[PDB]
Structures are given as structure tokens and as C-alpha cells.
Design a protein around this ligand. Structure first.
Ligand SMILES: Nc1ncnc2c1ncn2[C@@H]1O[C@H](COP(=O)(O)OP(=O)(O)NP(=O)(O)O)[C@@H](O)[C@H]1O
Ligand SMILES: [Mg+2]
Ligand SMILES: [Mg+2]
Lengths: 251, 121, 217, 345, 121
RNA sequence: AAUGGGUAAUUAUAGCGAGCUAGAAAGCCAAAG
RNA sequence: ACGGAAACGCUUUCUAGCUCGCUAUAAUUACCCA
């Protein structure tokens, strides 16, 4: 029963596909690979992927592909199996294209019993808000959580989210109140909340038992480290990771 | 002087300028300054920071004048609070309050001192 | 059915008590440990939290078989009269320990009372070098009484839990007369008497003839 | 229910002063009968400003006149014919032994220290003061509490460790707190007719004199029974507060062999019950760990008024003869030498 | 007269203006006035400062009348205290009290005097 | 020797500075069509 | 002869439950000044 009762909608698009189709092969060689056969095999590759392999990627998952083809994937479903779907889809598409041809999705969370145009338009606005991050971005749930995928799948979804889950399941003292107070200090964030966070985690370091104190010290020296990182691509990731961990353990 | 962009950084680098216990190796680099000689000084500015949100500055000038007395007195008793409020220029930050905004800036400065005192040692 | 009853009492002090206050804007050579007092009359209050957390812990050493180690591990005779946070049916706890305000201010003004709280000077003799450390702590004076309201709920879960919980509430009150309501306790400062135990129903129908006899046990 | 209550009974052999911090000055009493009248000086100045003489009063307060019986606010009222004395405070009868001079000097006492009083106005003994008398008997007669209770090489041999006796909340540990488990109550507020204001008489060794001091504290009369209630919630606390009878005898035995010897035995009282040194005028060695403060107590005095060599001047007083407690002539009590007897209820 | 924006500064420049041991060159710049004779002055007003919060001023002012005579008599004994009550205009400020907010400013000004005397020395 | 008087030090010290649960649900709508 | 006319982002919902301002602590020391 753990998990928030929401459904997500993702809309994808391969970024700059017409540019990757017309010009495409013109950089290597000296214009010697820009034939019709290269573009025909490229069309068969992209068509093969978006019309055959998306059903492979949507095999076990609880979703529905409302459209796939060309370079669009519009898909509704359960939000764990939408985020897992798009992480799997891109991590197979960048193996499929050797890391060329960025794709850039927009995922939006919606409650149950909401109309589907009010749902799809707000997903498509996240998709176009992730087109203009730089180009290659996923836009999780809102206009602000806009991450490059290489800055999302490695950092947020696998590094930080598993560290947060690993800490918050191997204990019993810290609960969701601590996670909520971390989300507030991550969202407001002036320079003063760095000091307030340094006070809060040091108070709770000496409040945990001596069995789990190096466990908490290796978590607070890991949270305070990215909170005060001064690159801005490490604090915004932690807020989305804590949103996903709260959404995983909702009653 | 403290401004809106640097009052937390001065409280960071002032705990680091406060000298610690060089000798007496039992959890060394502990401060001579104790926590309860510092939560008493914050106990004034916390109850001004909670009254400045409601009452006007022309009604709090009886307590704001007495912060200048209490920091002087607590520094006159123990040398460690003297070493605090001379390293962190608190008596020269109390000279400049003049309105609600700089008052709340100083009251957050006094909290950032305590937060970085708790964070180090 | 629904009923709501009330316990009237008088917390007569005997060597009056300190319940610590709040101000940092005190003084240099005056009261550094203020008593809690009413913010408009400047009369000492006994806050109901200091009554509740003394009765909740003194009965915990009597009625909990297994030692609690945490609140909301109480033995369901205390969990329902005070309230857990964690039992699903014992979130609320059917007792309302109202605050207590100094009743007999005119009786204390009949006696030669300069001010309603006395100040007590209490230095700490350093057991080597013989030097001192004066504290000037404030306490409400000796023959002060406090009106003690106590409101109890009787819903349709009290099949026979009504008269069982009154060998518990008066048990806790006669254990308050052996302990000290916070302050120092080990230095005096706590001894209370509970006078004119008078139970009555403020709402609903309940027969307190059989309840007003075990108040006078 | 481990609330084992006791019932201590306290018999004052010597005059006992406690507390209040404050002190009446030289011009804040009236000695015209054989009593001392201590008014409310606020009501004195209020009722005297009707007499249109407050500026002559202010002249009297800075009047540096000799012949001290004319300085003590008696002669101000006898000369200027103020005779109502309907003011606030109280009256206490005399010791009779305060002015050593039979030449007049009557009411020429100078600065009296007040006694601790409740806001009703009646004197009592606070339980926090009686617990500090219990705690030194418990500290000195327990050999585990006397070894490292010392400097640890920090400052000017400064202070007690305060942590030999295991005290605290102590996060992660159970809750001992031995002296939280020794709960001493305040006494019943006794009457004003037990107070006499003995003076002070410092009696030195190696110079056999008894030079008196200008410090005349309002002490309790001897032979005044005062009752106390002590509850011990720990069985470990119950053992010590039962064994106080052995421990007070052991403390007085180790303290007479340390300090009451080198003084003549005529000025030294006998116990007659279990001995205790209740505060204000018993000397430093009854308030300290006396067998651990031999090079550490006198170090604090590099002033005009230093402790002589070591083991400082004895603190006698002069209160009148009762029962006999004194054992000598000229009425030299010991100023704080009380006794007790305890029984479980 | 002393008001809210200046009484701590009046106390500061009062304590700097007390004369010192011109002779006795053993730890110099030491005042004639001592900590004991100044806390005997603060102990006069320390009772009235916390009787001022509870009681009305009109049921209190006879103590404020007598406290002038108390400062006179504590001045007329030592020359190091008669010097203090004239450097800091204590007797001049006792006549101008007349309410609660100046009683709690005079009793606070004595605290300021003790604070700066403890701070210097 | 008397006679005048008190003088100095401590004015609170060490702590805890909040913890945990809940973080929006149910309807209209959408679904059922 | 206005992709327009008519249409409340509306109804229900306690910032709540639990929690001792508490722990240790003689207003004491020194005996002297002119
Ligand atoms: N395999 C393919 N070969 C050639 N063209 C294709 C192929 N798949 C899709 N297209 C077309 O390529 C065009 C790309 O559309 P679109 O994605 O809107 O532009 P874009 O190049 O991706 N720029 P952007 O929308 O910012 O990503 C569409 O007209 C598609 O129909
Ligand atoms: Mg595209
Ligand atoms: Mg497209």
C-alpha cells in the first residue's frame, strides 16, 4: 500500500530529428556519407525503434501507450511505471543511437478522476518547457524540476534517490517529518537556511542512538555537502529526489 | 558592519576565528566558549525577533537598548564571551540597528553564530 | 450516550512552588528564574501541562507493568485517561487538565503580603575554595490556593470504565501530595494539598452520588 | 511506592543565621526600649515627610558625627520629638550581650544581616539550606567522593568537579541522580520571638584573643526545635539518609581532629545529639571538603583580610546562657553548631 | 535626564570618567570604586525593578522617594561612591522618574553602569 | 589602647533549544458508455 | 445581429494528537580598616 495514488502522463520527442535527418551524416567524411541509403536506413532505424521497441520497453509496466511513432511517445500510466518507462526508454535510445539524438520528455503527475485534455495539455507544456532547458531535458511534474537526463538518471534517480531510500529504510527514528523539514529547507534556501540546516542536522546527529550515529553522520555530511555546493545543479536534484521518496512511501 | 548578503558568512568565519582549546586533549579543539553562555545571548535576540514581527520599532527601543547592556555584561564576566563579541563585531553591529530590517538582520546574525557554533564541535 | 463531568479542587500550596518562566530581559541583580504567571494580572498560574506531566509520569511508575521507556507505551489505563499519540482509538484521552489561577488573592492580601511571589536567594557553595554563585529564583507564596478544574468525558465506550478511572485520578492526586509539581522538589518547592474535591456533571446525565464518596476516601 | 519519608528534628545549640541576602544599614533601626525596632523605612520616610524635616533627615544620614549612640536614628527621633513609631516592620528583643561596653553604647550596633523570611513575614529555615548541610556530611564521610574532586590543571586551583557525584540527564543512560532522590522540605515558619541578632567574635589560634567584628547577623536563638521532612525515593538514597546518624558523628570526629584541635576546649561545645553545621558563620571548613582544601582554600586570599596561616580563625558569638551548652564562661557559642535526630515515618 | 537612545552611552562615558589609582602602579587603571559598593547600589533598585512590573506606580512611589535617600546615604560614606553619583547624574535622574517607563529606565541604567564597570577592569 | 566603622569576592554555572504522526482526501467533472 | 447565449472552481473538512521548564546547587566565604 505504499505509494501515492497518482497517475503520470509522459510526452516525448526526439530533439532536432529533422536536423539529424537532413544534415545528419554530413559531418564525418567530406559529404561522402550523405546519400539516400543512409537516410533510408536511418528512417528504418528510427521507425523500428519507435514502432517496435517501445512495446518491448512497455512490457511489464502498468501504462498505456496512447501514441508512439515518428519521434513521439505519448503514454499514460502509473507514475512509478512512467518514470521507469522513460528512464528505460532513453537509456535504450542512447545505446541505440550511440549517444546521438537527444530525446526530451515531460512527465506530469495527476490525481485520479481528472479529464484527459486537462492532463495532456499540462503534460505537453512540460514537454515544451523541457525543450528549452538547453535542449535535452526531462521536466518532472512542474515547470521548475527541469533536469538534463544525464544530470537526472545518474544523479537524481540512481545516485541520490537510492542513497535517500537506503538511509531511510535502515532505521526507525527519523521519519517523514524529517524529510518534510528537509524539503522546506531545500525549497526556500537563502544563505540563512544553510546555517539553519547545519544546526538542524547537528542537533539530530546527537539525538540519534550510538548504534546508528555514523549512519546518520554519513548522511548529514552527504546532505549538507550538496546543499552548500554552489553549482545549483546539486540542490535542485535533492528536492526532486526527496519528492520521489515521499511519493514512494505515502500511505 | 553587516549587510543582507554577508551576515551569515561573517558568523561562519567568526566561529572559525574564535580560538579553541589547544590543550586538554579530551575531545580536543573544543571551544572555551560554552553553549549556555551563548544561548543566553540568543535568548534576548530571539524574543526581539519574535516581537519585531508584530510591534513597531518605536516600541522595542527599550529592549534594543538593553541588548547593548547584556552583551557588555556577559563579556565582562567571562573572557570567552569577550573573545566572542570582539572577534564577531557584535558591539559594532548593535551600534547600527535604527529600524526593523537591520534589527531582524542582527537577530538572524546572532542565530547564525549559534548555528555555526553547534555545527563546529 | 454522552456525558461530561468536572472535578473541582483547591491546590493549596505548602511551602510554595516554582514553575519556571521565560524572560531573558530580566535584570542583573534580580530574578533570573521567573515563575510562570498570567500575562495580564501578573498572578502565578499552575499550567495544566505541569499537572498533567506530573500525573502522567507518577502514575506511570504505578500502573504500567512494563516500564514505559517512551510516552504512548502506557498500560491502557493511562493511555485512555491521558491519550496516546500512536494508539488508533486512544488519540484523544478524555481528560482536560485546565490551568489553575490564584484564587485567594484577597485572603493573601488580608495577611501581610508585600507581593504575590516571593524571591529566594540560593547560592551554590563550591565545595572546594568555598566560593558562591547566587541565584534569585521566584516562587509563589506558601498559603496560595489555585482553582483546579478537571473535565472528564463519558462516551459510549465507558461500559464500566467510569468508576475504574476514579481510583486512578484520585490516586494520581494523592500521589501529587507525595511529590512536587516541578521546581526543585529536592529543595522543598512542591508540596501541595488538594482541598474540597467536588465532582459534578457539567453536561449530560450522570449520577455522581456514587462518585462523591470515593473522593473522600 | 518507594517514597520513604523521614522526620528530622533540629535542635539549635548555637545561633543559626540563614539567608535573605539583604541587610539593614546603620540608620535603619530604633533601640529605645530593650528591643530593636526595624521599621519599613519607606513608610518611615512617607510619614516623616509630613513632619517637614526630610532635608534635616538627609542631613542626619550624611552626618559624620562621633558618639555612635547619636548616629543610629534613635537620637534623630528623640531630639526632633518624633515619638509615634507606628511604622511597618517588626521588633526583636535584645541578646543583652551585643554591646560589650557597659559604658552606654546601647543600640550602637551597626549593620545587621536579615534572616530569610517568607512574604507573610515569618522566619523559617529553607530546605535547600538544610540540604547543603546534609550534602557535606554525605560528601566527607564517603571516601569515593574525595579523591579527584579537584583542579585537573585548568586555572587557579579553581573549583569542584561537580561530577564526582553522578548527576545529569545523561543521554543514553538510565536515571540515577542521587540528590534528586533526597528531597528536603522547608520548615514550618516559626515565630519572631526566636531571633536575637548575635554579633560575631573571631577567635584566633597562635594569638589568644577574641577580636569582635562589625557584622551582627539576625540569628535564631539556641534551643529552638525545628522540624523537617525528608523523602528518599531511591533505596540507595534511603541508605545514606538512614546512615546520617553514623555519618554526622564521623564528620564531626574528622573535623574536630582536623580543626577544633589547636583551639582551647572551653570555647568548644559538646554535641548532645547528632551534629550538623547549618549555615552562615560556621567557618569555611564546614562548607567544604575540608581534607581536600588545605592548599586550595587559602590561595584565594592575597588581600587585607587573609587567612592567617592555614585553618582559619574560629567563629564564636555571644548569645545568652541556656540549659549547659556553653561549658565555659563569657558565653561563646559556635554560630551554626546545631544538632538533629532522625526517624523514619 | 536619560532616555532610551542614550542611557547606555551615558553609562559608558560615566564609567570612563571615574578616576583611577594614580598611584599604586600594581595593575594600574584600577578604579577607586569597587564591584561590591556598586552592586550595593544596584541592589537598591533591583527590588523596585521587578516590583514595577506587577504593581502600579501610584501604589509604589514611596519606595522611589526613599531610594533617593538610600543613594544619598550610600554616597555619604565613601568618596568613591559620592564621586559616582555625580559623574553619572543619579540624584538628578531620581527626581525625574514620575512613571513606570522611567523607573524601568533608571533601574536599567544602574544595570548599564554595572555592566560597563565589569567590562572595564 | 580604646572610639568610629565594615571591607573584598560570587549575581547564576553546565544542559536540552523541540521530537514523532498526518502533508490533503472525498464529490461534482472524468469514468461507468 | 460578437464561436456566441446561459453557468460561483463550488460542497465537505478543528493545524490536530502526544509531551513536567525540568535536572544538580546551605546567600555563603574571608577577618579586618582608620
Ligand atoms: N524516421 C524518420 N525519418 C525522417 N523524418 C522523420 C522520421 N520520423 C519522424 N520524422 C519527421 O521528422 C520531423 C521532426 O518533427 P519535430 O520533432 O517536430 O521536429 P524536430 O526536428 O524534432 N525539432 P524539435 O521538435 O525541437 O525536436 C517530423 O515532421 C516527423 O514526421
Ligand atoms: Mg522533435
Ligand atoms: Mg516531435
Amino acid at each position: 500500500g505504499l505509494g501515492i495514488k497518482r497517475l503520470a502522463v509522459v510526452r516525448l520527442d526526439v530533439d532536432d530529428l529533422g536536423a539529424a535527418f537532413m544534415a545528419g551524416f554530413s559531418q564525418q567524411g567530406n559529404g561522402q556519407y550523405s546519400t539516400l541509403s543512409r537516410s533510408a536506413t536511418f528512417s528504418r532505424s528510427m521507425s523500428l525503434f519507435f514502432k517496435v521497441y517501445i512495446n518491448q520497453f512497455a512490457s511489464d509496466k502498468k501504462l498505456s501507450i496512447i501514441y508512439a511513432g515518428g519521434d513521439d511517445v505519448f503514454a499514460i500510466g502509473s507514475w512509478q511505471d512512467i518514470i521507469a518507462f522513460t528512464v528505460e526508454l532513453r537509456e535504450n535510445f542512447i545505446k541505440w543511437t550511440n549517444g546521438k539524438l537527444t530525446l526530451s520528455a515531460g512527465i506530469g503527475l495527476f490525481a485520479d478522476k481528472t479529464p484527459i485534455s486537462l492532463m495532456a495539455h499540462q503534460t505537453g507544456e512540460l514537454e515544451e518547457a523541457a525543450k528549452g532547458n538547453e535542449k535535452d531535458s526531462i521536466s518532472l511534474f512542474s515547470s521548475d524540476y527541469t533536469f538534463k537526463f544525464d544530470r537526472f538518471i545518474t544523479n537524481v534517480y540512481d545516485d541520490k534517490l537510492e542513497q535517500i531510500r537506503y538511509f531511510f529504510n535502515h532505521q526507525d527514528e527519523r521519519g517523514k517529518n524529517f524529510i518534510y523539514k528537509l524539503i522546506e529547507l531545500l525549497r526556500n534556501h537563502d544563505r540563512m537556511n544553510m546555517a539553519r540546516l547545519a544546526y538542524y542536522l547537528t542537533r539530530l546527529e546527537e539525538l540519534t542512538r550510538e548504534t546508528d550515529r555514523d549512519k546518520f553522520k554519513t548522511f548529514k555530511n552527504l546532505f549538507y555537502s550538496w546543499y552548500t555546493n554552489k553549482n545549483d545543479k546539486d540542490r535542485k536534484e535533492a528536492e526532486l529526489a526527496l519528492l520521489l521518496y515521499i511519493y514512494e512511501i505515502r500511505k | 558592519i553587516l549587510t543582507d548578503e554577508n551576515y551569515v558568512d561573517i558568523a561562519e568565519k567568526a566561529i572559525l576565528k574564535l580560538e579553541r582549546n589547544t590543550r586538554n586533549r579530551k575531545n580536543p579543539d573544543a571551544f572555551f566558549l560554552t553553549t549556555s553562555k551563548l544561548r543566553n545571548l540568543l535568548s534576548l535576540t530571539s524574543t526581539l525577533f519574535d516581537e519585531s514581527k508584530v510591534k513597531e520599532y518605536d516600541a522595542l527601543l527599550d529592549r534594543i537598548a538593553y541588548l547593548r547592556v547584556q552583551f557588555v555584561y556577559q563579556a565582562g564576566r567571562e573572557i570567552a564571551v569577550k573573545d566572542l563579541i570582539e572577534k564577531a563585531q557584535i558591539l559594532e553591529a548593535l551600534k547600527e540597528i535604527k529600524d526593523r530590517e537591520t534589527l531582524q538582520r542582527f537577530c538572524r546574525y546572532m542565530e547564525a553564530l549559534v548555528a555555526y557554533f553547534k555545527f563546529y564541535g | 450516550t454522552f456525558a461530561k463531568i468536572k472535578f473541582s479542587a483547591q491546590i493549596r500550596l505548602e511551602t510554595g512552588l516554582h514553575i519556571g518562566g521565560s524572560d531573558a530581559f530580566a535584570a542583573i541583580g534580580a530574578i533570573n528564574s521567573p515563575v510562570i504567571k498570567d500575562p495580564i494580572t501578573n498572578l502565578p498560574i499552575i499550567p495544566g501541562s505541569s499537572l498533567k506531566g506530573k500525573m502522567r509520569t507518577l502514575l506511570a511508575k504505578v500502573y504500567n507493568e512494563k516500564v514505559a521507556e517512551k510516552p504512548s507505551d502506557d498500560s491502557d489505563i493511562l493511555s485512555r485517561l491521558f491519550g496516546n499519540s500512536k494508539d488508533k482509538r486512544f488519540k484523544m484521552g478524555r481528560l482536560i487538565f485546565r490551568d489553575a489561577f490564584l484564587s485567594n488573592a484577597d485572603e493573601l492580601d488580608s495577611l501581610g503580603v508585600r507581593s504575590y511571589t516571593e524571591v529566594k536567594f540560593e547560592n551554590t557553595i563550591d565545595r572546594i575554595t568555598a566560593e558562591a554563585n547566587p541565584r534569585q529564583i521566584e516562587r509563589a507564596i506558601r498559603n496560595s490556593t489555585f482553582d483546579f478544574e478537571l473535565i472528564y468525558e463519558i462516551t459510549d465506550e465507558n461500559e464500566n470504565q467510569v468508576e475504574e478511572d476514579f481510583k486512578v485520578i484520585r490516586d494520581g492526586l494523592k500521589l501529587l501530595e507525595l511529590d512536587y509539581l516541578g521546581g526543585s522538589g529536592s529543595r522543598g518547592y512542591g508540596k501541595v494539598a488538594f482541598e474540597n474535591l467536588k465532582a459534578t456533571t457539567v453536561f449530560g446525565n450522570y449520577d455522581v452520588k456514587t462518585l462523591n464518596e470515593l473522593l473522600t476516601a | 511506592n518507594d517514597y520513604r519519608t523521614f522526620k528530622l528534628s533540629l535542635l539549635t545549640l548555637a545561633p543559626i543565621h540563614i539567608g535573605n541576602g539583604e541587610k539593614y544599614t546603620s540608620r535603619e533601626f530604633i533601640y529605645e526600649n530593650k528591643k530593636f525596632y526595624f521599621p519599613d523605612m519607606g513608610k518611615f520616610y512617607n510619614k516623616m515627610v509630613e513632619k517637614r524635616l526630610a532635608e534635616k533627615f538627609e542631613a542626619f544620614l550624611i552626618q559624620t558625627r562621633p558618639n555612635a549612640r547619636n548616629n543610629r536614628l534613635i537620637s534623630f527621633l528623640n531630639d526632633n520629638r518624633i515619638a509615634e513609631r507606628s511604622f511597618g516592620g517588626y521588633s526583636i528583643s535584645e541578646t543583652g550581650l551585643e554591646s560589650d561596653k557597659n559604658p552606654n553604647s546601647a543600640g550602637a550596633i551597626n549593620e545587621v544581616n536579615k534572616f530569610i523570611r517568607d512574604a507573610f513575614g515569618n522566619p523559617y529555615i529553607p530546605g535547600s539550606s538544610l540540604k547543603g548541610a546534609i550534602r557535606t556530611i554525605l560528601m566527607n564521610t564517603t571516601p569515593k567522593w574525595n579523591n579527584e574532586n579537584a583542579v585537573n590543571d585548568f586555572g587557579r586551583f579553581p573549583k569542584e568537579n561537580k561530577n564526582l557525584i553522578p548527576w545529569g540527564p545523561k543521554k543514553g543512560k538510565e536515571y540515577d541522580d542521587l540528590f534528586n532522590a533526597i528531597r528536603v522540605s522547608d520548615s514550618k515558619p516559626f515565630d519572631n520571638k526566636s531571633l536575637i541578632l548575635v554579633q560575631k567574635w573571631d577567635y584566633s589560634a597562635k594569638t589568644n584573643k577574641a577580636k569582635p567584628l562589625p557584622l551582627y547577623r539576625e540569628s535564631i536563638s539556641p534551643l529552638t526545635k525545628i522540624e523537617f521532612e525528608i523523602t528518599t525515593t531511591t533505596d540507595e538514597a534511603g541508605r545514606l539518609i538512614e546512615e546520617l546518624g553514623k555519618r554526622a558523628q564521623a564528620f564531626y570526629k574528622d573535623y574536630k581532629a582536623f580543626f577544633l584541635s589547636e583551639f582551647p576546649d572551653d570555647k568548644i561545645q559538646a554535641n548532645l545529639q547528632y551534629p550538623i553545621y547549618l549555615g552562615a558563620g560556621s567557618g569555611a571548613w564546614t562548607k567544604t571538603l575540608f581534607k581536600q582544601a588545605d592548599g586550595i582554600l587559602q590561595r584565594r586570599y592575597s588581600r587585607m583580610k587573609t587567612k592567617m596561616v592555614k585553618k582559619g580563625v574560629l567563629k564564636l558569638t555571644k548569645a545568652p546562657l541556656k540549659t549547659s551548652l556553653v561549658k565555659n564562661h563569657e558565653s561563646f557559642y559556635e554560630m551554626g553548631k546545631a544538632n538533629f535526630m532522625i526517624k523514619e515515618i
